[PDB]
Amino acid sequence: ANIVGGIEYSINNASLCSVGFSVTRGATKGFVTAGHCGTVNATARIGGAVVGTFAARVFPGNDRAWVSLTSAQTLLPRVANGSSFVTVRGSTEAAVGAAVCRSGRTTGYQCGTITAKNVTANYAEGAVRGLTQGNACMGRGDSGGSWITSAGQAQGVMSGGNVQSNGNNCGIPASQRSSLFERLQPILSQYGLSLVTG
């Protein structure tokens, strides 16, 4: 399969999440995603085919993971925006106030701004600290998906947010949204990963 940020993948033929970013670890191909999406050794599938397994994850506390892919997979420096693509050009972290977008299999490509950093989320499993908050909307299933600026700077992966009864927070004003992502930089260094760029 072609690995693009924002696309759907399943975990152990059960839960669904979204791809964060194509990365490499030496000769090994992979993609970063959210830790709550799967446990170590869990099987990832795209288009009905096995593409790899969860190599490592930290959740809760943090919310990160990377899926180690088979060499048959095709890594791409891109994030889905409708039928088009946003090119991944680097991982410069944007400041509070910056515009930012996210991509996922439930709500697609959504944009907003970064409103706060170092935010704690109290999830069912425990607290996750150090998350960055934006007001682009999201929904259940967008987890693990790309957060990237229009200029191509990869920011992080979708962790969680204040989803309403309809499963997303797109039906409430941006001012009331808390959409949280796990910063990309600590994921890359923790697992010795290099972002695939173009």
UniProtKB/Swiss-Prot annotation:
Paired cysteines (S-S): 17-37, 101-111, 137-170
UniProt-annotated catalytic positions: 36 (charge relay system), 63 (charge relay system), 143 (charge relay system)
UniProt record similarity statement: Belongs to the peptidase S1 family.
UniProt name for this protein: Alpha-lytic protease
Lineage of origin: Bacteria, Pseudomonadati, Pseudomonadota, Gammaproteobacteria, Lysobacterales
Full-protein residues shown: 200 to 397 of 397
